[PDB]
């Protein structure tokens, strides 16, 4: 059932991801240094990481079969509304359940709740982000499922402001059926048990997390002294 047009999509998406995700984390030395121990000590370093991550999510999104065919206005809308969510998803690769932190090579670049808290987010709103990473990590997705899930997330037709929703849906279905078919044919039991449905559930949880992120970014950015510490891409993508 794994049609050939589908194994191609997969190869495209894997190569895309390989070209936009360096598991060595070499580029992180360019970011403004991390500061642990005052207020918003971690903001400059994490603002840099996010902005970098947004760049990388854009390069990923551009290779999504079909994405090209959309209007530039639709591409922008899709990316603006998914960036944070794809960032949350792609972060799962560095997140570890051993101590509920994002381990990016070295202790300089190993981020936990306290660090995130020093980027202007209370420990309370950060917890659901952790619970999300935990439940996603437990799915133990294949790298193929991972990239499909990020692409499906980007091409969502219900994002506010979408013009050609019909075409977004057409592109997303192509990717959904690819994933559904991939799991049945390639993912053995019991890990495959309802694995699709659970993958789609994470897309629902991400909408919730997105909303919460927007609300919190609205409060943070409204303080011009904080917004000053962001990047121009973050201001443009997440808003000003």
């Amino acid at each position: 059932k794994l049609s050939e047009e589908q194994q191609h999509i997969i190869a495209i998406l894997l190569d895309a991801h390989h070209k936009t995700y360096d598991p060595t984390y070499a580029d992180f030395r360019d970011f403004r240094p991390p500061v642990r121990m005052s207020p918003l000590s971690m903001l400059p370093h994490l603002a840099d990481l996010v902005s970098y991550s947004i760049q990388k999510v854009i390069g990923f999104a551009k290779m999504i079969p079909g994405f090209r065919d959309l209007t530039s206005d639709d591409q922008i809308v899709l990316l603006k509304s998914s960036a944070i969510e794809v960032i949350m998803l792609r972060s799962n690769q560095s997140f570890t359940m051993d101590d509920m932190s994002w381990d990016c090579g070295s202790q300089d670049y190993k981020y936990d709740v306290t660090d995130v808290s020093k980027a202007g987010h209370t420990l309370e709103l950060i917890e659901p982000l952790i619970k999300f990473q935990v439940g996603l990590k437990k799915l133990n997705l294949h790298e193929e499922e991972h990239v499909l899930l990020m692409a499906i997330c980007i091409v969502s037709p219900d994002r506010p402001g979408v013009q050609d929703a019909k075409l977004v849906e057409a592109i997303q279905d192509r990717l959904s059926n690819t994933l559904q078919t991939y799991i049945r044919c390639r993912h053995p039991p019991p890990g495959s048990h309802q694995l699709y449905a659970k993958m789609i559930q994470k897309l629902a949880d991400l909408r919730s997390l997105n909303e919460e992120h927007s609300k919190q970014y609205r409060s943070l950015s409204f303080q011009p002294e904080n917004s000053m510490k962001l990047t121009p891409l973050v201001l443009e993508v997440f808003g000003n």
């Binding site: 760049q55 854009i58 390069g59 530039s72 591409q75 922008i76 603006k80 891409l233 443009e236």
Partner: peptide
């Protein structure tokens, strides 16, 4: 908006 940075990273 008019986001020129995004549009440029998009192509």
């Amino acid at each position: 908006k008019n986001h020129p940075m995004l549009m440029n990273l998009l192509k």
